[PDB]
Amino acid sequence: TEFKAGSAKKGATLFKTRCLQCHTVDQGGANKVGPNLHGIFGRHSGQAEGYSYTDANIKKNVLWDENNMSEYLTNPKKYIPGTKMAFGGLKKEKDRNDLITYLKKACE
Amino acid sequence: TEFKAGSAKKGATLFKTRCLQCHTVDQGGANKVGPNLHGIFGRHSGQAEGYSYTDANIKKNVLWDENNMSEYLTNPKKYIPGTKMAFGGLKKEKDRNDLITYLKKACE
Ligand code: HEC
Numbered sequence A, B: 001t002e003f004k005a006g007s008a009k010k011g012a013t014l015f016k017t018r019c020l021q022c023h024t025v026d027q028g029g030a031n032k033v034g035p036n037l038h039g040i041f042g043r044h045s046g047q048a049e050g051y052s053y054t055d056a057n058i059k060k061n062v063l064w065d066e067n068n069m070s071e072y073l074t075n076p077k078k079y080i081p082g083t084k085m086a087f088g089g090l091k092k093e094k095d096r097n098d099l100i101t102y103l104k105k106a107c108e
């Protein structure tokens, strides 16, 4: 990969403080500003049921794995030019590892 | 002060991942490598019952408040030359704010 597991506890709080404003991760969780992420891993971009993605996202056709996810989390708009997610990015790889460990775990 | 409250959720996980290895915060919690911190705020250094502090700590006679605590957390050994706490420090003020918000809350 390029990714190393971290703290899921740590990732849970990153999520609550940086992602929850626009996303849910729970099965049967609702779309909000952003789409619900439950089952995102191993899925391609733009396929959450009932959500209005931008063309950019859809077209990017990213297969979502832990590695991809890390790259995206660094600077989303640079990864998907045109995306409407208004999140500047997580620069430290340690923060990303934690968050993805948590997402890995909660989105399943 | 100089301190700003932050996320207690965030601080809880900082604690678990950076402080728990040697300290407890709960009332009736045990001394471990480091002393139990319950009721540390407004208390001076070296007065946890049953703990073997170094001379440095004791002599420092710091009155523990949120501000002091932030300074100490930056680089403990620079704050208390001679201290045996083997913790290099939390460089980002945001991390410290979070942790202290949590300690503020859990140590009472
Ligand atoms: C609102 C200000 C957001 C925050 C904060 C975060 N995200 Fe986001 N996300 C948001 C939108 C509006 C969208 C859709 C973008 C589009 O162009 O259609 C997204 C998208 C994602 C995706 C892609 C989803 C998919 O392909 O199914 C992921 C993986 C994602 N968001 C994750 C994520 C995380 C982990 C965040 C916290 C660090 C985060 N986002 C912040 C809106 C917002």
Ligand code: HEC
Residues within 6 Å of the ligand: B015, B018, B019, B020, B021, B022, B023, B033, B034, B035, B037, B040, B044, B045, B046, B047, B048, B052, B053, B054, B056, B057, B082, B083, B084, B085, B086, B087, B090, B099
């Ligand atoms: C073990 C490797 C430690 C870690 C990790 C942390 N602390 Fe610590 N702490 C440790 C010791 C051995 C001691 C006693 C030092 C001495 O010289 O006698 C301390 C002391 C403190 C204090 C001062 C306590 C008092 O005056 O009553 C505080 C406020 C404190 N420790 C807090 C603290 C926090 C919040 C930590 C995580 C960021 C942390 N310590 C890490 C050992 C260890």
